[PDB]
Amino acid sequence: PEMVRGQVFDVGPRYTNLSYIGEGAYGMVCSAYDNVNKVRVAIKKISPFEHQTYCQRTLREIKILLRFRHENIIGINDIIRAPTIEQMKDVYIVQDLMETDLYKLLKTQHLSNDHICYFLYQILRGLKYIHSANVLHRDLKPSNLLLNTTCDLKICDFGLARVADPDHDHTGFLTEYVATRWYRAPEIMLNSKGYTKSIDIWSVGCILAEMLSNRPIFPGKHYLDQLNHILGILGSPSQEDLNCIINLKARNYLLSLPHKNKVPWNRLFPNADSKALDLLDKMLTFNPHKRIEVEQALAHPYLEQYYDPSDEPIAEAPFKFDMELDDLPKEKLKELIFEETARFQPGYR
Numbered sequence: 001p002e003m004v005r006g007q008v009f010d011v012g013p014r015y016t017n018l019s020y021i022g023e024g025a026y027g028m029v030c031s032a033y034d035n036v037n038k039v040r041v042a043i044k045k046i047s048p049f050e051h052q053t054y055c056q057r058t059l060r061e062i063k064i065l066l067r068f069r070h071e072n073i074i075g076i077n078d079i080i081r082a083p084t085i086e087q088m089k090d091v092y093i094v095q096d097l098m099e100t101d102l103y104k105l106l107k108t109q110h111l112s113n114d115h116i117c118y119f120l121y122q123i124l125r126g127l128k129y130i131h132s133a134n135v136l137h138r139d140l141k142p143s144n145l146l147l148n149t150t151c152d153l154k155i156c157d158f159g160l161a162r163v164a165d166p167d168h169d170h171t172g173f174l175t176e177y178v179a180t181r182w183y184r185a186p187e188i189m190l191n192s193k194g195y196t197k198s199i200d201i202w203s204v205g206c207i208l209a210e211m212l213s214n215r216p217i218f219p220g221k222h223y224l225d226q227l228n229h230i231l232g233i234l235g236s237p238s239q240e241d242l243n244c245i246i247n248l249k250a251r252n253y254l255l256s257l258p259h260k261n262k263v264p265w266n267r268l269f270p271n272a273d274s275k276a277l278d279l280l281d282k283m284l285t286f287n288p289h290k291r292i293e294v295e296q297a298l299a300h301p302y303l304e305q306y307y308d309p310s311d312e313p314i315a316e317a318p319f320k321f322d323m324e325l326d327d328l329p330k331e332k333l334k335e336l337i338f339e340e341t342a343r344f345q346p347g348y349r
């Protein structure tokens with residue numbers, strides 16, 4: 001089997017000519033050539049079966065991305081794994097090949113207002129479809145916004161995605177321990193339940209701010225420092241803001257901090273389009289119930305030159321997982337992953 005940076009990529013003979021792209025905390029991603037369809041592809045290798053939480057990420061990503069079909073959301077073309085469950089140690093997810101991601105782009109390039117506007121439009125267009133299926137992405141960030149040579153944008157990395165159900169869901173804390181928290185909504189760090197579609201809008205606002213300045217707007221080292229970054233710009237929460245914190249210990253924690261004045265957006269972004277800052281203000285609202293919704297954002301004057309609801313599709317029906325996964329042992333999750341990937345095996349019946 002072909003080898004990339006001393007790592008086995010056992011994907012031949014169909015997929016050949018592998019080249020390292022990059023990696024996240026869980027997967028190593030290569031470009032490859034599909035000799036059957038005669039097209040370029042991306043291939044993500046993950047090795048999750050020794051960790052319950054990694055098994056959760058793999059099963060969630062596979063189940064959701066195989067049900068979604070949208071221009072601004074990455075698709076899964078193929079999945080490779082061993083013919084028996086005992087032999088299955090790695091999973092290879094084959095996707096359309098993109099050229100870069102927004103994290104890498106912002107490291108080398110400053111974006112014009114027209115590019116910012118277009119990227120933001122495509123993010124929200126994809127997010128509109130995700131939310132129309134009653135799904136929360138929960139981990140939006142520059143590194144999982146993929147870009148191609150023609151400036152098309154696709155959202156990827158759905159391992160933390162969940163069906164929205166604030167009143168009856170008990171996900172608890174984001175059991176994610178290796179990746180960045182700079183894009184996480186304040187209520188995530190203050191509460192362990194009741195997450196709504198507004199958490200994704202907060203993330204998009206953080207991404208907008210970073211496109212405006214090429215620097216992350218709230219780059220804390222831990223949740224403690226992270227909250228101080230947020231409050232240092234939004235100012236101390238209002239009385240109504242305090243009423244939306246459910247955890248009384250978290251509310252009493254916020255009450256114990258010194259007072260902080262709000263910083264005007266045009267002090268942070270003095271050269272930015274005023275319409276961009278108006279939309280930014282409505283996305284980075286402390287109170288999730290007052291935060292702008294995805295359809296309202298698409299209709300905001302900042303995005304006027306691209307907004308087109310006739311060409312902003314939605315899901316036919318809200319997505320469902322068909323079971324809860326948080327309490328299953330990793331051995332059971334391994335069986336579910338095997339079953340979910342059997343449709344890509346020869347002889348599936």
Ligand SMILES: Nc1ncnc2c1ncn2[C@@H]1O[C@H](COP(=O)(O)OP(=O)(O)NP(=O)(O)O)[C@@H](O)[C@H]1O
Nearest residue numbers: 022023024025026027029042095097098101143157
């Ligand atoms: N289809 C793709 N085409 C091109 N590059 C891709 C593709 N999928 C992923 N990448 C790159 O690979 C990186 C890692 O992918 P990702 O799906 O985020 O991996 P992960 O380890 O499972 N989760 P995370 O730690 O959140 O990044 C991305 O940030 C992109 O740079």
Ligand SMILES: *[C@@H]1[C@@H](C(=O)OCc2ccccc2)C(=O)CC[C@]1(C)C(=O)OC
Nearest residue numbers: 099100105114115118147148149150151
């Ligand atoms: C997109 C690309 C480009 O020229 O896009 C033109 C454009 C104008 C207005 C609105 C939207 C797009 C460019 O020059 C920068 C590279 C970029 C960002 C791209 O190729 O992404 C990888």
